[PDB]
Amino acid sequence: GAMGSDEQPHIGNYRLLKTIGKGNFAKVKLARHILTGREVAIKIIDKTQLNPTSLQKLFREVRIMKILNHPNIVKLFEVIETEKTLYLIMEYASGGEVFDYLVAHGRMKEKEARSKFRQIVSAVQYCHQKRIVHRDLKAENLLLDADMNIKIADFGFSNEFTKLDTFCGSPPYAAPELFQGKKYDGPEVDVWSLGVILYTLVSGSLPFDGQNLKELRERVLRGKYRIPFYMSTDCENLLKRFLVLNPIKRGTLEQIMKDRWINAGHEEDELKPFVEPELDISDQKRIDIMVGMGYSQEEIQESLSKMKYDEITATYLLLGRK
Amino acid sequence: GAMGSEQPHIGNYRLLKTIGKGNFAKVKLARHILTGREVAIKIIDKTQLNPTSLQKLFREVRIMKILNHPNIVKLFEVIETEKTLYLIMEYASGGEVFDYLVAHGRMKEKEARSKFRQIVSAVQYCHQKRIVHRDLKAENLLLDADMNIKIADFGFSNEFTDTFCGSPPYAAPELFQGKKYDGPEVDVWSLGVILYTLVSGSLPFDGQNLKELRERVLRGKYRIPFYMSTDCENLLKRFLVLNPIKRGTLEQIMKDRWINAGHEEDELKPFVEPELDISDQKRIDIMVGMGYSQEEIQESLSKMKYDEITATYLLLGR
């Protein structure tokens, strides 16, 4: 309700700073957590505009979001739900989109590229192991935070909840089996997209481009791409593992993590499937601070163990980093 | 005498369809004439048994007489002839829990909860009577007409029920470590596997052959579906513990949050067999109406003979 003399609007314990994404059934605002100081990105979804089927799908998606806990996937911090609106307090990536960065600053050096691709392959692999496939990757799915770390956004989140824009991003990342008419589900598809993502990181360009769809299709179906003169032969070899026309001949991410290029300069640190560490819900330094914010220990233990995504849990998580 | 070439009888029971045929034993649906109640009769050809099998058979009869729990198939009466043995017991019309799962999908946690309290109670009770199964399968959990659990053949061999069919997936990891495979801990692990089926509608560990099964059981990792409450997940982490020493005890597990949700003042606690009421006049008067003497009733009921009076009295209880 109005909070502070002459300040910005608030939802829940969050100060709303500025709209940083508009479009369709959803807005996104930058916000600051009053209790804690952290900045967050808050999804605002108009429930009003949604039918009961959408509504139910949305909630199950929000449930998936809760399960995703990876250093490179944007984390969910809190759900505030009103009568007309749904507020998803997400982790904030100020860096922008990866591909945008690439256009602005040119290609990445293979070392820089490797560091990011490791994170991307780790993140997308973690999602596959949980049987979450996206099958629709666009530039808009890969973000950078203020620390130039990869944050994957909206993975497993359907497009209804992010307007006539649905097909802008997809074709350059779509796998050839879409244009052939063979089945277009399965992690195989995502793998195709990841190879494309690799290419843009090290070349600063799309491996398959086109002035129109006809032209993009032609190239994608044919699967041929410049190996720019600067591209190390190991990088060329990695690409061969991702961009194979026949989907069953593509490498799984689990195998690909063993590749010579992905592991270069990481002798003792071979990339592996990510093992989710048990969330410590007993950090007493953190609990004491919240006691100080006027929350009872009884109530903290409860929201934490229950793992409800309310203001208590959020504060804890945000206290943080994260 | 005969019933007319119409269904045959044995004792006070009329014999309807056969519901299970195995080697050594058959099971027939039957109706108890005096009372109308539906029963299952296990018919065992003594004729074809060597002394050892005979003894195993009688141990299983001893064990049924001890176990009395609303969720363990009860014994009502025994009829023995020099050559045939009939055990008259509760009918479970619902079939096997796992079958019901496969047919109708997983239960909602509220539903899985109330079945699981029944299962936990019953096994803890057997452990309390010092009876440990070490061989939990799907066919050990049946459902009755009212959707209540009825554990069958707990504490038995399977000689009188093809045998290694269902048990590997419920087998405890120590089975594949050449250690000792006894102790209630094994039953506890299996119980963890059963939870998984109730809430998921499938198995936590599976494989196309023994090796594959072993590898997954030994690793002890398993999928947590999106729909599964974190409380349910936490409770599972108390049963599916690779180290037999670190596995939760039933008596402690009964106090779990999940186990008790929607039962705030009615927490799960070890079962306490009440003393059998042998003094229900309402029933006794009905029985005297059937031609039984007042005192032959006490004779039978005190001693607890599993004869025609005892069966009649208990059957009148339901």
mmCIF file of C-alpha atoms in Angstrom, chain A residues 63-64 67 130-132 305-307, chain B residues 223 225-228 230-231 234 257:
data_model
loop_
_atom_site.group_PDB
_atom_site.id
_atom_site.type_symbol
_atom_site.label_atom_id
_atom_site.label_comp_id
_atom_site.label_asym_id
_atom_site.label_seq_id
_atom_site.Cartn_x
_atom_site.Cartn_y
_atom_site.Cartn_z
ATOM 1 C CA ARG A 63 6.942 -25.282 -9.489
ATOM 2 C CA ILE A 64 9.662 -26.313 -12.017
ATOM 3 C CA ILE A 67 13.428 -27.030 -8.495
ATOM 4 C CA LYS A 130 15.877 -33.384 -14.507
ATOM 5 C CA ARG A 131 14.002 -34.231 -17.733
ATOM 6 C CA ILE A 132 13.395 -30.522 -18.463
ATOM 7 C CA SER A 305 12.177 -26.608 6.290
ATOM 8 C CA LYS A 306 8.807 -26.486 4.435
ATOM 9 C CA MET A 307 10.813 -24.677 1.737
ATOM 10 C CA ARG B 223 14.345 -39.470 -9.391
ATOM 11 C CA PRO B 225 9.284 -35.959 -9.616
ATOM 12 C CA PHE B 226 8.235 -32.247 -9.816
ATOM 13 C CA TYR B 227 4.915 -32.981 -8.174
ATOM 14 C CA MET B 228 6.545 -34.480 -5.051
ATOM 15 C CA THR B 230 9.736 -31.694 -0.190
ATOM 16 C CA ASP B 231 8.378 -33.299 2.990
ATOM 17 C CA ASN B 234 12.712 -35.875 3.178
ATOM 18 C CA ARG B 257 5.782 -34.460 9.673
#
